[PDB]
Amino acid sequence: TMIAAVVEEANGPFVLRKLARPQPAPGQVLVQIEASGTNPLDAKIRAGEAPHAQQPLPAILGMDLAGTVVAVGPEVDSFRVGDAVFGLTGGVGGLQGTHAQFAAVDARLLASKPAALTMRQASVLPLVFITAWEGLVDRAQVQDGQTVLIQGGGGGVGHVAIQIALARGARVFATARGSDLEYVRDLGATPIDASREPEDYAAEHTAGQGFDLVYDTLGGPVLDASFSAVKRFGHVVSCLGWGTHKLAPLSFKQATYSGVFTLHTLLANEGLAHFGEMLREADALVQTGKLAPRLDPRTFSIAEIGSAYDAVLGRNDVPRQRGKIAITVE
């Protein structure tokens, strides 16, 4: 058996329960979770308002993890007992979440934890790094020298998208709110107050031409703002492009737009190997000091998960997360 937090019904509390401990099937390893990375989507799932996540209740939530391999299933040779690992492993599509002491994970989803990171630090980068990578690299194939605008540079996907873009040689700019402008500047990017109009910051920073690549990490009206900021023949990508939008800007500018939906891999069981690969890329960036997760200093035990999400969403009067929130399971 093991201890895990279960959300029994919509909007219900994170109930600590003693449950049967998962056993690794062939191709899987058993991970003793030390840190669980939170994400806003978990809150939507908890509230039963995340149809795209296909994670009906009751269920153990949490998508990212960082821990140690304690058992290896048959047909596995990529990891050994004692190895520190991390990755985006479940919490969606019926997959057991990471708000647990243990999880049986397909080895392809894991990568060794970067030696330079604590478990907390490593636990918050899987989903957002993969989300940023899929958009910047897989879809937009960002090139050295291109001008890149990250909408919401202080956010989960934003701060990692900025660092990936910089590492790949792009000239990076990022819109952020007051409290995050200094953070973005320190990363090496050019900060832009998010209250400004695209026509204005594009004028100041791109001679009014627009940006080669715009990564919308906020969605809604921000995606429209992104269409406005993109250069002719440019590319716009979004990881929250679920709404309806006027497309005229893309035609007038003979531009391109791509959608990003990282969850597909776990929901449909396809391209699992690509996850471990992307995480390996992240590790390389950490080793060379070009990637550092933004981790809120606050700690939360497996018994304080509710408070963890209050922080993630800045609800019930707790300051909003400044960087991401990690739960210390062990």
The residue ranges that bind a copy of itself (CB under 8 A) are 17, 19-23, 25, 27, 54-56, 58, 93-95, 106, 178-179, 181-182, 186, 267-269, 296-299, 304, 307, 311, 314, 317-319, 322
Least Cβ distance, residue 246 to a copy of itself (angstroms):
30
* Smallest distance from a copy of itself to CB 105, Å: 11
Comparison of 281 and 296: residue with beta carbon closer to Ca ion: 296
Residue 4 one-letter amino acid? A
Nearest distance, CB of residue 40 and Ca ion, angstroms: 6
Smallest distance, Å, CB 124 to Ca ion? 8
Q: Which stretch binds Ca ion (CB under 5 A): 152-160, 185-193, 206-214, 253-261?
A: 152-160
> Residue type at 7?
V
CB of 36 to a copy of itself, least distance (A): 18
Residue 152 binding Ca ion, by CB under 5 A: no
44 binds, among a copy of itself, Ca ion, none (CB under 5 to 8 A by kind): none
Over the range 48-84, which residues count as b (16 or more CB within 10 Å of their CB) and which as e?
Answer: eebeebebebebbbbbbbbbbbebbbeebebbeeebb
User: Counting every residue, how long is the chain?
Assistant: 330
d(CA 18, CA 302): 13
Nearest residue to Ca ion, by Cβ distance, number only: 156
Smallest distance from the beta carbon of 323 to Ca ion, in angstroms?
Answer: 9
Q: Is 87 in the site for Ca ion (CB under 5 A)?
A: no
How far is it, in rounded angstroms, from Cα 114 to Cα 267? 27
Does position 156 interact with Ca ion (CB under 5 A)? The reply is yes
Interaction partner, residue 169 (a copy of itself, Ca ion, none; CB < 5-8 Å by kind): none
Do 327 and 305 form a contact (C-beta atoms < 8 A)? yes
156 binds, among a copy of itself, Ca ion, none (CB under 5 to 8 A by kind): Ca ion
Residue 228, contacted partner among Ca ion, a copy of itself, none, CB below 5-8 A by kind: none
Residue 150: partners with Cβ closer than 8 Å, 6 or more residues away: 158, 161, 162, 165, 172, 173, 174, 175, 189, 215, 217
Q: Which of 241, 269, 172, 261 is nearest to 211 (CA)?
A: 172
Question: Which tokens is 65 given?
Answer: 């993890």
Q: Does 91 interact with Ca ion (rule: CB under 5 A)? A: no
Fill in the per-residue mask, 101 to 140: x = in contact with Ca ion (CB under 5 A), - = not in contact: ----------------------------------------
CB of 127 to Ca ion, least distance (A): 8
> At closest approach, how far in Å is the CB of 204 from Ca ion?
28
Residue 154 contacts Ca ion per CB under 5 A: no
Rounded CA-CA distance 63/309 in Å is 13
Which of 278, 276, 271 is CA-nearest to residue 134? 278
- Measuring CA to CA, how many Å separate 306 from each of 7, 22, 57, 209? 10, 24, 16, 46
Exposure of 196 in the CB half-sphere (CA atoms within 13 A): 21
Note whether 166 and 189 are within 8 A (CB): yes
Q: Which does 48 bind (CB under 5 to 8 A by kind): Ca ion, a copy of itself, none?
A: none
Residues near Ca ion (CB under 5 A) are 156
